[PDB]
Write a protein that binds this ligand. Structure first.
Ligand SMILES: Cc1cc2nc3c(=O)[nH]c(=O)nc-3n(C[C@H](O)[C@H](O)[C@H](O)COP(=O)(O)OP(=O)(O)OC[C@H]3O[C@@H](n4cnc5c(N)ncnc54)[C@H](O)[C@@H]3O)c2cc1C
Ligand SMILES: Cc1cc2nc3c(=O)[nH]c(=O)nc-3n(C[C@H](O)[C@H](O)[C@H](O)COP(=O)(O)OP(=O)(O)OC[C@H]3O[C@@H](n4cnc5c(N)ncnc54)[C@H](O)[C@@H]3O)c2cc1C
Ligand SMILES: [Cl-]
Ligand SMILES: [Cl-]
Ligand SMILES: [Cl-]
Ligand SMILES: [Cl-]
Lengths: 496, 494
């Protein structure tokens, strides 16, 4: 049985790990987290995926407690703007499709359908009317019912790290602020300790690499091989800003992904401000050009706002667990934030680390099974993301023209062939766990313009009444909800 | 749209198909079923899988209506006898494992704990021979998914019952032999030519002719892929054995390992169904008949034995041109996990979903074929796991099972399983009827057991899981005291 964990890095990954380990094992694990006082955290990572409520539940934290305290907001979905038709948009919401007489509402929409998201999802209305997912009395709008509309969150990246470090430290995590200068290895190549500038050697049984893109343990010490995805997903840089909203009250309960001339831009509404960034490929546009394009769109004349330029490491380690070291966060893998998966990868890496926790024997088969899961997790998203670029109909710049013909991962060709005939399902999407469900694959395809040539032939043999009564039911439930629900900001104000 | 379906074959496959199509499309589909008056149905296929309730629900039939009428009983799971330690047994039940603090009861059992007895309510119900219903008809536990119990029924009666259902709903019934299958200039089926009713044509043809594969294999040249290299059982001998005491009725199938295969016991309302599944490379058809009779029906030579040659494997494609194979014509594996009728149901459900329009869509058809292939391949792999987990080594047959070649992917599942339990991510990843608990339950019961408990559990409070084991033990106690016997309940609804 092993006793102690040493985490290197104090970004969102480090502090999520420290928190979760203490929540899981309490006093049956010793945890130390070492982080540099001079190497900054990435500074971004402000939108989350639908699994994140489980992370906070596991920690014993209600959203009323943790959300104001991370200066956050609600994420009901993502609004995709300008990807295909210009001025046009759709939502990818956190909401499962209803099923009528064996077929989901997407199939029926194609046969008897108003845009797809609008006809099929309550969430669409909530986004348009800028509603909170809760009534003022704190009851969920569905009124588990939380799974049927698995909304996520926006939060401030500084605050969440600050908040979780306090959570972890309150629970006995030893905190060291220092630079690791060298990582020791025993005669078998296993990590023996990390040598700091002022605190000597810090040893332990298990080491968690949370050093970001740098991969200081997993790559620079252990020689882990990093598999780049630049061949299919070229975006390799970002430029970020923190932009105050002219009107705080005007707060959207969703992230916006807006296609730009050489990439795309995020808008993440927080309680006090927006987060903004342009994800781009430097083969098509320079870092200044991108900064200029970004500022022009979301912050004209606001040169007091400092831009944060980021070089992204896109792809994954072949193995995120090597010897006694596990990489969590940007050190393990990263794909561009088009579907807000970075924090999801962290949560899933940590939840599966607890499941695959080593005993004094360090069982290689259990480690191997952990590595497979993490590989599948990222490869599924990678494929899902390439599908975004293949579905995007705009062709107006060298960038968008090149996205159309660029090589694809194995498997996607088949998914596109299928999709031109009929909708993807549980059996034809990526088959291993990667966060996303069928509705997400379908919703992107239909929003972007990858549509079956014709409706499902079976539906012509069937009574359309039950599905038409369902579309009407959705339309009426939507009407009632936007009338009864407070705004996104209103509800958040009431719980601050 | 297409208008008409012609089904060839009136076994369980033909009639399930006819029934389901009418249930699905009512008067928006014309259906004709043609079946031989002289080529007998297989005569077996008496246990079902957990999915089967959905088939009957879809048809609009409550179990109280259909079950006594098919002379059936309850299947709470399968009892595996003599597979590893001799005289030893365990249950593979239709019951999901409870989860405590992020780990299922199997994991906890390994850390703090027989397996089936500790983890499943169904184990007690089987031992005490209970019905899954109280006399007022309420379920013992929707709550139906948590304990997805299935059924036993008489194979003659179910065909008889479903043909009536379908015919009442406008299925045209023809009793004749198909002598020739016509094809058009594209190799599509144009009609079936019968001995006395001329040509019967339609848009879609469903091959329900059994192992024969009259349309899909003999006419269309579909290729059959054999599984004999990994699952050599190629024959069966069956009996219909009356129970000395009808009241003594088990709510489960028994799979008993024998010298050169295994034997099923399926308790029906009036009688048992019995059979020995074997490989003729290790035992002759009469040796097997002698071994069967000796075990379940000593001295009862008045009972006629049904000897069957099984075609084990699957068609590469079950849907070719305008013809879809359903049932034994499509695929078959030995009935060790009662999957034949499941394969039919799933084939038919997916046929409705993949139903063709007037414009035939090769991509939709290809997606149908992938699902049918995965369905059977998943079960194939799961069954080889039974033979690999069986620890008995007492005959040439059991010795050979130990070293026989395996399907791709199973070696990995066995390496994993010696380390820790299989899960949703490491079992066969495509739909094949079975869930994780089934894979786990078979491993633990047969004796493929992680070397040690999961190390994470040593860092955790065992109290919640121990309180759960106790809760299960107490709920079990209460259920066997309150539930009527399997026979008692069935008697009350006859
Ligand atoms: C442009 C961009 C946009 C993103 N958007 C999203 C999003 O919308 N949603 C989402 O979920 N994710 C997003 N991500 C991912 C998100 O930022 C990360 O998942 C999250 O911030 C965790 O980062 P990290 O902890 O792994 O790395 P970092 O923040 O880089 O942390 C590295 C830590 O290691 C420390 N360190 C480095 N070297 C040493 C050393 N020598 N000794 C001691 N300490 C050391 C540093 O001091 C720091 O504490 C985005 C990423 C990028 C690049
Ligand atoms: C030994 C054994 C045990 C089994 N146990 C189980 C079990 O426990 N549980 C389970 O779910 N499944 C079991 N199965 C499978 C089960 O028997 C079948 O799934 C089910 O009976 C359906 O069979 P079928 O309709 O495909 O074939 P068949 O019963 O053989 O039907 C063939 C039909 O085609 C007709 N036909 C053939 N040729 C012509 C022609 N020339 N013209 C007109 N009609 C023709 C015949 O008349 C007949 O109606 C078992 C199978 C075997 C062999
Ligand atoms: Cl489905
Ligand atoms: Cl991300
Ligand atoms: Cl899990
Ligand atoms: Cl079977």
């Amino acid at each position: 049985m092993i006793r102690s964990v040493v985490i290197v890095g104090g970004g969102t990954a480090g502090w999520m790990t420290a928190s979760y380990l203490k929540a899981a094992f309490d006093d049956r694990i010793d945890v130390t987290l070492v982080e540099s006082g001079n190497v900054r955290r990435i500074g971004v990572g402000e939108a989350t995926f639908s699994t994140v409520r489980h992370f906070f539940d596991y920690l014993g934290l209600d959203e009323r407690e943790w959300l104001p305290r991370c200066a956050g907001g609600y994420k009901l979905g993502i609004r995709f703007e300008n990807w295909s038709e210009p001025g046009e948009y759709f939502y990818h919401p956190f909401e499962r499709l209803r099923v009528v007489d064996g077929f989901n509402m997407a199939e029926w929409w194609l046969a008897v359908g108003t845009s797809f998201s609008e006809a099929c999802y309550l969430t669409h209305r909530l986004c348009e009317a800028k509603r909170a997912p809760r009534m003022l009395d704190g009851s969920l709008f569905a009124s588990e019912q939380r799974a049927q509309f698995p909304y996520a969150y926006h939060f401030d990246a500084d605050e969440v790290a600050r908040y979780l470090s306090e959570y972890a430290i309150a629970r006995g995590v030893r905190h060291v602020v220092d630079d690791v200068q060298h990582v020791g290895q025993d005669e078998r190549g296993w990590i023996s300790g990390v040598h700091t500038k002022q605190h000597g050697e810090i040893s332990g049984d298990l080491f968690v690499d949370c050093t970001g893109f740098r991969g200081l343990l997993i790559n620079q010490t252990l020689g882990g091989r990093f598999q780049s995805f630049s061949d299919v997903l070229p975006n390799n840089r970002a430029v970020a800003l923190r932009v105050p909203r002219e009107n705080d009250e005007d707060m959207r309960p969703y992230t916006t992904a807006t296609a730009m001339s050489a990439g795309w831009m995020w808008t993440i509404p927080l309680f006090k401000r927006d987060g903004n960034g342009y994800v781009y490929s430097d083969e098509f546009i320079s870092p200044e050009e991108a900064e200029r394009e970004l500022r022009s769109t979301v912050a004209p004349g606001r040169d007091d706002l400092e831009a944060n330029h980021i070089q992204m490491r896109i792809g994954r380690n072949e193995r995120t667990w090597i010897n006694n070291c596990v990489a969590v966060g940007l050190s393990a893998a990263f794909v561009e934030p088009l579907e807000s998966t970075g924090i999801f990868f962290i949560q899933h890496a940590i939840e599966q680390l607890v499941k695959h926790f080593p005993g004094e024997r360090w069982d290689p088969v259990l480690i191997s099974a952990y590595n497979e899961r993490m590989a599948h997790m990222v490869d599924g998203v990678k494929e899902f993301l390439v599908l975004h670029y293949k579905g995007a109909q705009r062709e107006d710049t060298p960038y968008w023209k090149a996205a159309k013909t660029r090589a694809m991962p194995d498997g996607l060709a088949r998914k596109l062939e299928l999709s031109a005939s009929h909708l993807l399902d549980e059996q034809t999407i990526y088959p291993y766990y990667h966060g996303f469900e069928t509705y997400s694959w379908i919703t992107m395809n239909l929003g972007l313009g990858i549509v079956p040539e014709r409706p499902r032939p079976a539906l012509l043999h069937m009574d359309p009444a039950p599905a038409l009564a369902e579309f009407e039911r959705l339309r009426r439930e939507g009407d009632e909800l936007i009338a009864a629900l407070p705004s996104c900001y209103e509800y958040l104000a009431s719980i601050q």
